[PDB]
RNA sequence: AUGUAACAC
RNA sequence: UAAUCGAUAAACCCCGAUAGACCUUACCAACCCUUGCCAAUUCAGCCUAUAUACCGCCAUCUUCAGCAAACCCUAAAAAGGAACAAUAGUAAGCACAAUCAUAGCACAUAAAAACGUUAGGUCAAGGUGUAGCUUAUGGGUUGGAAAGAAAUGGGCUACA
């Protein structure tokens, strides 16, 4: 983003909006380039950058089958039209062109799948190592494991071996369908693993990772064969994957809520983890830092969060977290830990490092700094974070007005900060009186703030403006400002308070009335006291 | 950076004697061709395939025009 | 569109000049050498005269690339003097200033 | 809906480092620069313009990414890549005995999509003639063979080659010229006795 | 021919010829009427005659939480939006050709008897809405100068009065 | 290449990513001329008719 | 009278930018150059292609930011990457600013076959140097 | 605009702190010339106008000195000469005339008591005293003045200063006194150089009409001049040019007591002769005593000749001559 | 205080091939304005002293290329408008210097070259003899 | 020595 | 002659042209082509007329110092507005001045020179309002553009 203050995004929604706007501009301009390639044919750059040339999405030769087939495969409908044009002229597609067409159909796209299956097997005896590969990863998305098992049987009749992705998708297909018996699928996974060892194919990283992915969605107590799988990975010498480690953390997090033995196993294995530089060579490593912070947010520990933040910082910062969404989840629960399990001197220092830079707060990380400053009794820090939350938190502001303002009556107010208190009150109560539910708790807070500040007229005006909003506070506020006017000897304010309290039927109107006989006896206003009594009895 | 000139060396650019093999060795044809190949050796901007194309164009020209060399007064092969 | 039909004709003239540039070199090599027989040289004049007219480099006119003025053009910028002054007085050209010594 | 934010100057700390703010070449964006800088010809009652909305500060090249502390950090990073110069070759005379042949080559940089400059093909090979094993008669034949390329005062031979498209081909042709001059200077032929 | 064309400010300044020698002395107003229309008024920035519908200029970024694709309206929608644009153009023309009626004081063409409303407020914040001002004489007065020759200076005489007995006159 | 420059910028003008005030001026002036009634005739009708 | 690149003296109400308020004989005295590139030096080639690229950039930015472009561009050429520096008013939404920024970046990168930077500063109104 | 000035002062201090941070220097000793070279490094404008270069200085020095508020909230003016239009200038004339009247009264009292204890201190000529320029007096009085008002104030100051002087009145007058720098056209005498047992040789540079001349002269030899490795007679066949080579030595009566060698480059014969003449004149100052150096100065040897050929103007022929102007 | 850890990841592979030695390397920068060249000279000399090169910098004399154009559009040849281009030179001499140091210093200078300037590098290098000259005779 | 005959606020 | 155009008192006359053998070329004579440079257009294209519609670039007064917004005064005001021992003038601003370049001051030169005057020059650098063409006032090919009865301006070479 441009760091001009007009173009600085105020919130995370604005950040996503600006990034997707720039990406849509890139896509639109590249659409212009691919729509009119003849305007960009002239080359000025002599070292001839190949990516800067316009890209041709057109087939080169129209009616020649052996070229037009692969030309329309390398671009679904076009590959099908090329196959139909090859078949209508009695041109026989070989084992490579049919493989490419089947791969193009499987990568894009359920009756047409069976039609493509009949196209694969009915015309030519197409080779297994393309045909079962394409179809078994096809019916993973198309939800049919019985035909995949039938193709597995047909493969094992025909002497050819089964590769790593074969047992990946077939262990997935056998596991994912469970009819009231999980052991019959687990033993089938074990037999497929034994035959994986048998057919001289070295089992890869993602083979045992896929077995764990199968193990996730069935049992919370299926983590013992997962641990044996993880140790079988460490026995053979292949460096384990972070997707595998995430999924181990997922089962042991599911086991964490009943008992913490799984949590201490997590903490031991990440203590083994934390000393290595990382190379993310696996596609599913996105939720690793999500779940390794989810367990820490669940069990409320922070030295682990320190060294996992160092683990994020050590090898490469940005390539291990997939999305901005899970990245603000990470930082929200990270501050949820760091706020109350560390002290204010480092909390405010990482506040200015994380919040105005990395992501802007959500409500869960908005409430928690408020409760942390209320615990730590820090009243000076409120206006700056209020001005920050005015920028980043316009959506949650009305939901969290009371929870922002509840800190203001817990502490005591020395007379040095009354300018800051008056400004923090005045901006809120000008913005939400210029428009919006506004509670009487804020009236209590603003009245005790001007009671400690020694300003009576503005507080009286603020209470009078609230009682023009067709609702009333409780009578404790009325007695508090009655004490404020009793210390300053203002009888007409007390007359207005008691008259508009008796007209609105407060439950402690008896207490207010006795308090203003006390006030008018102190100020020798007993004639107006009897006049108020005459007004009340009428 | 990025231009290796098809991996050619200086001996293919300077010395053009191996493409002068089929020429009349003693006539004005040798005179004309050594001036031409001296110019092609001195020229920096032209590629070796295009120099071969120039020599083969001259060979083709002297191959089509044969009778005028006979009525020139000197016999050339 | 080019701004003028004279500009369009000069583009076409440069195009045939680049297309026939090698053959003019090859024939003029035979022409400009006195070691060659005169019977060959008059023939070489015949195929240099039978070439198309617009393939010759002397028909190439240096015009302004902005407004196609036939003369008053600086060779460095390929611009007419009025357009050069218009971009130079606005400061759009680096290193160019009104001269004071 | 108009929005206005204060710049980074209010959020900038006293002891923050500048190369973290400015890694690379920048157009002098004025919001991120805390210095109040003024440039422009003033009015007789007026003052020069401030940093906001000024195109002269946008026109000017900036050295903000080349602050001296950043120079120390960057050169401490490049210290791992450099290698030491030999102690025995400290003097020009010992360089003259050890490496007698020097080769002038040129590389050019310009702002544009095109890299190639036609003057980059040149190679200028200079040899001091006292470092070779030329005889008396072979030396005189060498001077009468090369002519103007040899200086009679400083006794150096300078061969400039231009004809090859590449600088490596020009270097090979120049060193080939040197070795064929060395091999043909020693040859005494039948017409050399006249 | 794209480099040949110019800026709209230069085009309008060359078109209306407001700085010409005809309007200088008073030689103009014989056959001279040029109207300036802002051509950047009714532009939605991403509007095009092919009708491409852009995710940032014409239509917003997000629909139902998802990312919109670059699309094109139908041809029927194209003459509908073009009809709306041109009907906005004759709406602007209809607003432009309407002339405000000038209230006559004494005669049809003279400025005598015409009121100009309340006078302007003073520097002290004093505001006078009760006064009315009327023109009694308009007269084009010429002067002879060394450079311009004839120099036309319009002098007028007005009267102010609130109707309560306070009145005044000036030139 | 003035042809490719003019063609690219005209296509951007009709696709509404670049706005061209000069062709807007020509379009408005030709619209005003046709509204006045003095337009460009068909090819072949001018001389005999 | 000299009339090149000058604004005429009106009654005293027209706002003027600093570049328009100086005559061309103040170039490299009081005001600078709106484009900086190599090709105008002493023994350097390729000036005309940079000149026509400069012209096409001025017209394309002037029509790409219609009305919200304040004043003349700054065009910097530094080791084949081309920096285009702009003053844009707060007229269009930042959605549309980022859309046009990404569009102009990709289009000019693929059209001049060189890496492009688009650097913007967005201002409330036209900056006034004199008069007004 | 006082709060604007205070805001400029505080953000100038903050920006000074950031500039010291980004240079990595000591912020307490960080001074104005450090600021100047700092801005000249970080924002290097090559511009011919020195005031158009980027600056960040004290806002008091950059912003012009402003008139303060001239009245209270009730509208009553603070100063009792506000209704004259020029309150500060007329208050200055009021104070000067009050001091002059007090001087006259005190001097009349001293005449009555028969004591003259004052002295005339108007002559500050060895200091090189001048009064204020009208621009400087405008800057001091923060208001525009006129030449007649300035002359009136200066002649009132002369009236005050020509009287017997009190200490307070001299302190009042010396605010308006300015000092000139040192006025002297005396050249710096180059010391003699001794090198490798050679005694009393001197070096001189001359420049006249593109010709640059180095002249080195020995006082221990006979009279001969070696120009560019050849004899002066062979190098300069012109008797006038040999007279130009003569002229300083015949002026100092030392024709044969110096041995010279020369190196001149550029121009023609007379330009080289003039450059050699100027270079010998500048080289001979070491041997020759101070009053004869001034005699050389009024003979015109030591002053360089500024006559340089002009540029040809466009539309003209030879920088003065234009083309033939036809009347009809 | 948020300090990322282990930021350094260098890749330096030492070949068995002898490194190229340069006798001298001349950097001639040409620009339009003097202040940019002066600050760039200060940057280059500071980088040179921290790299340990012990360099010398001198200023070659400038040249100005001047030409004359017509003042008006149609016919005014008596009155002309003249234009001026100013180029300024600064030359850095680099002495007793090696190949990898040459490469890293040159690319550090090249990536920090500003927008309005150009430069030429002239490298003279050390090479003893070719293999067909040493002491054979035919 | 003279220079006619179509200027508009 | 079949054979351009513009300038044409100071402020035209080796002037557009820092530049015409074909090209340039807009002229003339023969021939040819009419959605005829472009993504599209009942559209392109015009060196067709108007510089008395203009913008852009200038000449001249001119190395002259004045121009002018907003106020105020005059026993009315068409207009004028100053007296320094001061009698109605304040005046933001533009010019002059100051500053800058000819690599050190200074001088000199260069640069600058406002508002306006000459309806001064330029639809032929380029765009354009208005008025005229659309199988032609448009687009291509070939070949030709003479010449001096005479007069005159500016230069070069001399007349020693
Ligand atoms: Mg045209
Ligand atoms: Mg030509
Ligand atoms: Mg009427
Ligand atoms: Mg002369
Ligand atoms: Mg008569
Ligand atoms: Mg005409
Ligand atoms: Mg005429
Ligand atoms: Mg005239
Ligand atoms: Mg012809
Ligand atoms: Mg011709
Ligand atoms: Mg025509
Ligand atoms: Mg005119
Ligand atoms: Mg005319
Ligand atoms: Mg004046
Ligand atoms: Mg007046
Ligand atoms: Mg004024
Ligand atoms: Mg100076
Ligand atoms: Mg002067
Ligand atoms: Mg001048
Ligand atoms: Mg001046
Ligand atoms: Mg006229
Ligand atoms: Mg026209
Ligand atoms: Mg003349």
Automatic annotation (TrEMBL), chain C:
GO annotations of cellular component type: cytoplasm; ribonucleoprotein complex; ribosome
GO biological process, one term: translation
Sorted UniProt keywords: Ribonucleoprotein, Ribosomal protein
GO molecular function: structural constituent of ribosome
Family stated for the protein in its record: Belongs to the universal ribosomal protein uS14 family.
Protein name from the UniProt record: 28S ribosomal protein S14, mitochondrial
Species: Sus scrofa
High-level lineage: Eukaryota, Metazoa, Chordata, Craniata, Vertebrata
TrEMBL record, chain D:
Keyword Cell inner membrane: no
Entry annotated with the keyword Coiled coil: yes
Protein origin, superkingdom: Eukaryota
GO cellular component terms attached to this protein's record: mitochondrion; ribosome
Residues of the Small ribosomal subunit protein mS35 mitochondrial conserved domain: 117-187
GO MF term (any one): structural constituent of ribosome
Keywords: Coiled coil, Ribonucleoprotein, Ribosomal protein
GO BP annotations listed: mitochondrial translation
Protein known as: 28S ribosomal protein S35, mitochondrial isoform 1
Complete-protein stretch covered: 92 to 285 of 366
Automatic annotation (TrEMBL), chain G:
Source taxon at top rank: Eukaryota
Keyword Kinase: no
GO cellular component labels: mitochondrion; ribonucleoprotein complex; ribosome
Record's keyword terms, sorted: Mitochondrion, Ribonucleoprotein, Ribosomal protein, Transit peptide
Keyword set includes Zinc: no
Main location: mitochondrion
Subcellular location: Mitochondrion
Similarity field: Belongs to the universal ribosomal protein uS3 family.
Name the record gives this protein: 28S ribosomal protein S24, mitochondrial
Organism: Sus scrofa
Residue window of the full protein shown: 36 to 167 of 167
TrEMBL record, chain I:
Highest taxon above the source species: Eukaryota
Residue ranges the record marks as coiled coil: none
Subcellular location: Mitochondrion
GO cellular component, one term: mitochondrial small ribosomal subunit
Keywords per UniProt: Mitochondrion, Ribonucleoprotein, Ribosomal protein
Main subcellular location: mitochondrion
Domain Small ribosomal subunit protein uS10: 26-122
Membership in a protein family: Belongs to the universal ribosomal protein uS10 family.
Protein name according to UniProt: Small ribosomal subunit protein uS10m
Protein species of origin: Sus scrofa (Pig)
Gene name of this polypeptide: MRPS10
Location of this fragment in the whole protein: 51 to 188 of 200
């Amino acid at each position: 983003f441009q760091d001009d203050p007009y173009l600085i995004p105020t919130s995370s929604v604005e950040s996503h909006s600006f990034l997707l706007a720039k990406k849509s501009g890139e896509n639109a301009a590249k659409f212009i380039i691919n729509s009119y390639p003849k305007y960009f044919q002239k080359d000025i750059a002599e070292p001839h950058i190949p990516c800067l040339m316009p890209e041709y999405f057109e087939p080169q030769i129209e009616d020649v089958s052996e070229a037009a087939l692969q030309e329309r495969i390398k671009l679904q409908e076009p590959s099908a039209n090329y196959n139909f044009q090859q078949r209508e002229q009695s041109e026989e597609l070989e084992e490579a062109t049919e493989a490419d067409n089947e791969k193009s159909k499987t990568k894009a796209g359920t009756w047409r799948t069976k039609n493509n299956a009949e196209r694969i097997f009915a015309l030519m005896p197409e080779k297994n190592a393309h045909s079962y590969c394409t179809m078994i990863r096809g019916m993973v998305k198309h939800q049919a494991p019985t035909q995949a098992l039938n193709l597995y049987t047909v493969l094992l009749n025909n002497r050819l071996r089964a590769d790593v992705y074969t047992f990946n998708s077939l262990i997935e297909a056998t596991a994912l369908v469970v009819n009231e018996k999980f052991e019959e699928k687990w033993n089938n996974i074990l037999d497929l693993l034994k035959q994986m060892v048998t057919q001289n194919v070295k089992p890869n990283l993602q083979t045992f990772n896929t077995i764990l992915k199968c193990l996730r969605r069935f049992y919370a107590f299926g983590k013992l064969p997962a641990l044996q799988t993880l140790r079988e990975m460490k026995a053979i010498g292949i460096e384990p994957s972070l997707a595998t480690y995430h999924y181990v953390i997922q089962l042991f997090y599911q086991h964490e809520s009943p008992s913490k033995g799984s949590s201490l196993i997590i903490y031991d294995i990440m203590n083994e983890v934390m000393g290595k530089r990382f190379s993310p060579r696996d596609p599913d490593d996105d939720m690793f830092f999500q779940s390794a912070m989810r367990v820490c947010s669940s069990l409320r520990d922070l030295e682990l969060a320190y060294q996992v933040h160092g683990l994020l910082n050590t090898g490469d910062n940005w390539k291990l977290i997939g999305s901005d969404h899970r990245r603000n989840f990470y930082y929200s629960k990270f501050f949820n830990l760091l706020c109350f399990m560390e002290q204010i001197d480092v909390t405010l220092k990482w506040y200015k490092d994380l919040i105005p830079s990395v992501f802007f707060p959500h409500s869960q990380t908005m409430i928690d700094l408020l409760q942390a400053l209320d615990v730590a009794n820090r009243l000076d820090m409120v206006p700056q974070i209020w001005k920050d939350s005015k920028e980043y938190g316009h959506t949650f502001r009305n939901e969290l007005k009371e929870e922002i303002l509840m800190l203001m009556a817990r502490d005591q107010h020395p007379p040095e900060l009354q300018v800051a208190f008056a400004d923090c009150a005045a901006d809120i109560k000008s913005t939400y009186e210029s428009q919006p539910e506004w509670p009487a708790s804020s009236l209590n807070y603003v009245a005790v703030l001007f009671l400690r500040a020694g300003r009576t007229q503005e507080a009286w005006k603020m209470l009078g403006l609230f009682r023009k909003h067709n609702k009333i506070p409780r009578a404790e506020l009325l007695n508090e400002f009655l004490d404020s006017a009793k210390a300053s000897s203002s009888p007409a304010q007390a007359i207005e308070l008691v008259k508009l309290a008796s007209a609105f039927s407060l439950p402690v109107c008896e207490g207010l009335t006795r308090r203003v006989m006390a006030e008018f006896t102190l100020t020798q206003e007993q004639r107006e006291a009897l006049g108020e009594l005459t007004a009340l009895t009428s | 950076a990025g231009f290796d000139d098809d991996g050619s060396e200086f001996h293919e650019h300077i010395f053009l004697d191996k493409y002068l093999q089929d020429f009349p060795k003693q006539g004005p044809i040798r005179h004309f061709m050594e001036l031409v190949t001296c110019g092609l050796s001195k020229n920096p901007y032209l590629s070796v395939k295009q120099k071969v194309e120039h020599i083969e164009w001259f060979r083709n020209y002297f191959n089509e025009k044969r009778v005028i060399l006979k009525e020139s007064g000197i016999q050339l092969n | 569109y080019y701004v003028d039909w004279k500009m369009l004709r000069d583009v076409k003239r440069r195009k045939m000049a680049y297309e026939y540039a090698d053959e003019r070199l090859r024939i003029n090599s035979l022409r400009k050498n006195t070691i060659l027989p005169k019977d060959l040289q008059e023939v070489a004049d015949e195929e240099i005269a039978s070439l198309p007219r617009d393939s010759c480099p002397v028909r190439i006119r240096n015009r302004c690339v902005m407004t196609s003025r036939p003369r008053g053009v600086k060779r460095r910028w390929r611009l007419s003097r009025i357009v050069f002054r218009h971009l130079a007085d606005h400061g759009q050209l680096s290193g160019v200033q009104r001269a004071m010594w | 809906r108009r929005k206005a934010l204060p710049p980074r100057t209010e959020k900038m700390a006293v002891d923050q480092d500048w190369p973290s703010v400015y890694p690379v070449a920048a157009p002098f964006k004025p919001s991120a620069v805390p210095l109040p800088v003024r440039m422009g010809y003033p009015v007789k009652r007026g003052v020069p313009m401030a940093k906001e909305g000024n195109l002269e500060l946008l026109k000017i090249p900036n050295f903000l990414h080349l602050t001296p502390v950043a120079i120390k950090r960057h050169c401490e990073a490049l210290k791992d890549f450099c290698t030491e110069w030999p102690a025995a070759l400290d003097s020009d005379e010992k360089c003259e005995k050890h490496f007698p042949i020097e080769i002038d080559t040129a590389d050019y940089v310009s702002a544009g999509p095109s890299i190639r400059n036609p003057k980059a093909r040149v190679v200028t090979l200079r040899v001091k003639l006292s470092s070779l094993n030329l005889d008396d008669h072979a030396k005189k034949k060498l001077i009468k063979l090369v002519g103007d390329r040899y200086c009679k005062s400083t006794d150096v031979l300078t061969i400039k080659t231009d004809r090859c498209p590449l600088k490596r081909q020009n270097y090979d042709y120049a060193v080939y010229l040197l070795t064929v001059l060395y091999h043909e200077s020693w040859k005494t032929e039948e017409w050399e006795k006249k | 021919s794209f480099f040949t064309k110019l800026t709209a400010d230069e085009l309008w300044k060359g078109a209306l010829a407001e700085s010409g020698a005809g309007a200088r002395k008073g030689r103009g107003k014989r056959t001279k009427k040029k109207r300036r229309k802002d051509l950047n008024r009714g532009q939605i920035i991403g509007e095009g005659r092919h009708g491409f519908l852009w995710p940032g200029l014409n239509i917003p970024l997000m629909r139902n939480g998802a990312v919109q694709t670059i699309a094109q309206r139908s041809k029927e929608d194209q003459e509908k939006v073009e009809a709306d644009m041109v009907q906005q153009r004759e709406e602007w023309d209809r607003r432009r050709k309407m002339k405000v009626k000038r209230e006559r004081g004494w005669s049809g063409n003279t400025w005598g008897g015409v009121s100009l409303g309340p006078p302007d407020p003073g520097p002290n914040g004093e505001t006078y809405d009760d006064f009315d001002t009327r023109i009694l004489e308009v007269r084009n007065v010429f002067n002879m100068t060394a450079k311009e020759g004839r120099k036309r200076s319009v002098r007028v005489l007005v009267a102010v009065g609130n109707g309560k007995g306070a009145a005044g006159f000036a030139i | 290449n003035h042809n490719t420059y003019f063609a690219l910028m005209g296509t951007l003008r009709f696709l509404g990513l670049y706005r061209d005030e000069h062709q807007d001026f020509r379009d408005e002036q030709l619209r005003l001329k046709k509204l006045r009634g003095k337009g460009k005739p068909r090819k072949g009708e001018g001389k005999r008719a | 009278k000299n009339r090149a690149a000058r604004v005429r003296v009106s009654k005293g109400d027209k706002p003027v930018t600093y570049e328009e308020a100086h005559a061309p004989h103040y170039i490299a005295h009081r005001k600078g150059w709106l484009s900086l590139h190599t090709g105008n030096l002493d023994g350097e080639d390729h000036a005309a292609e940079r000149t026509v690229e400069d012209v096409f950039l001025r017209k394309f930015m002037l029509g790409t930011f219609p009305g919200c472009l304040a004043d003349q561009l700054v065009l910097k050429r530094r080791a084949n990457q081309l920096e285009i520096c702009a003053l844009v008013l707060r007229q269009l939404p930042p959605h549309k600013f980022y859309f046009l920024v990404g569009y102009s970046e990709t289009l000019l990168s693929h059209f001049y076959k060189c890496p492009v930077h688009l650097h913007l500063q967005t201002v409330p109104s036209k900056v006034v140097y004199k008069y007004i | 605009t006082v709060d604007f000035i205070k805001k400029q002062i505080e953000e100038f201090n903050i920006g000074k702190r950031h500039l010291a941070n980004m240079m990595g220097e000591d912020p307490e000793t960080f001074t104005q010339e450090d600021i100047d070279r700092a801005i000249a490094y970080l924002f290097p404008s090559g511009l011919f106008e020195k005031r158009a270069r980027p600056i960040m200085k004290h806002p008091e020095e950059i912003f012009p000195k402003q008139r303060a508020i001239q009245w209270g909230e009730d509208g009553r003016p603070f100063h009792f000469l506000f209704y004259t239009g020029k309150q500060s200038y007329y208050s200055l004339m009021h104070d000067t005339y009050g001091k002059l009247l007090d001087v006259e009264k005190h001097h009349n009292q001293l005449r009555a008591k028969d004591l003259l204890a004052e002295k005339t201190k108007i002559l500050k000529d060895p200091i090189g005293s001048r009064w204020l320029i009208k621009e400087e007096l405008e800057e001091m009085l923060v208001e525009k003045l006129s030449d007649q008002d300035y002359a009136q104030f200066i002649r009132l100051l002369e009236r005050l200063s020509a009287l017997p002087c009190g200490a307070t009145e001299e302190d009042f007058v010396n605010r308006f006194r300015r000092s000139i720098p040192i006025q002297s056209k005396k050249q710096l005498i180059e010391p003699l150089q001794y090198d490798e047992q050679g005694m009393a040789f001197s070096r001189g540079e001359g420049k006249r009409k593109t010709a640059k001349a180095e002249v080195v002269v020995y006082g221990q030899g006979s009279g001969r001049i070696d120009v560019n490795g050849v004899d002066y007679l062979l190098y300069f066949p012109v008797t006038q040019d040999r007279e130009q080579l003569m002229f300083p030595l015949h002026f100092l009566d030392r024709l044969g007591k110096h041995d010279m060698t020369c190196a001149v480059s550029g121009g023609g014969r007379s330009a080289q002769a003039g450059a050699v003449r100027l270079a010998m004149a500048r080289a001979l100052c070491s041997f020759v005593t101070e009053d004869e150096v001034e005699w050389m100065r009024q003979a015109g040897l030591l002053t360089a000749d500024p006559r340089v050929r002009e540029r040809k103007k466009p539309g003209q022929e030879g920088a003065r001559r234009k083309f033939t102007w036809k009347k009809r | 205080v948020d300090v990322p850890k282990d930021m350094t990841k260098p890749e330096i592979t030492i070949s068995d091939e002898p490194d190229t030695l340069y006798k001298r390397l001349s950097v001639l920068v040409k620009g339009h304005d003097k202040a940019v060249l002066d600050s760039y000279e200060y940057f280059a000399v500071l980088a040179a002293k921290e790299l340990g090169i012990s360099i010398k910098v001198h200023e070659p004399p400038r040249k100005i290329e001047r030409f004359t154009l017509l003042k008006s559009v149609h016919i005014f040849k008596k009155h002309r408008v003249q234009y001026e281009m100013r180029t300024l030179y600064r030359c850095l001499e680099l002495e007793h210097l090696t190949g990898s140091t040459a490469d890293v210093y040159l690319e550090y200078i090249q990536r920090n070259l500003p927008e309005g300037v150009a430069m030429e590098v002239t490298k003279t290098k050390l090479e003893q003899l070719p293999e067909h000259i040493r002491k054979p005779i035919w």
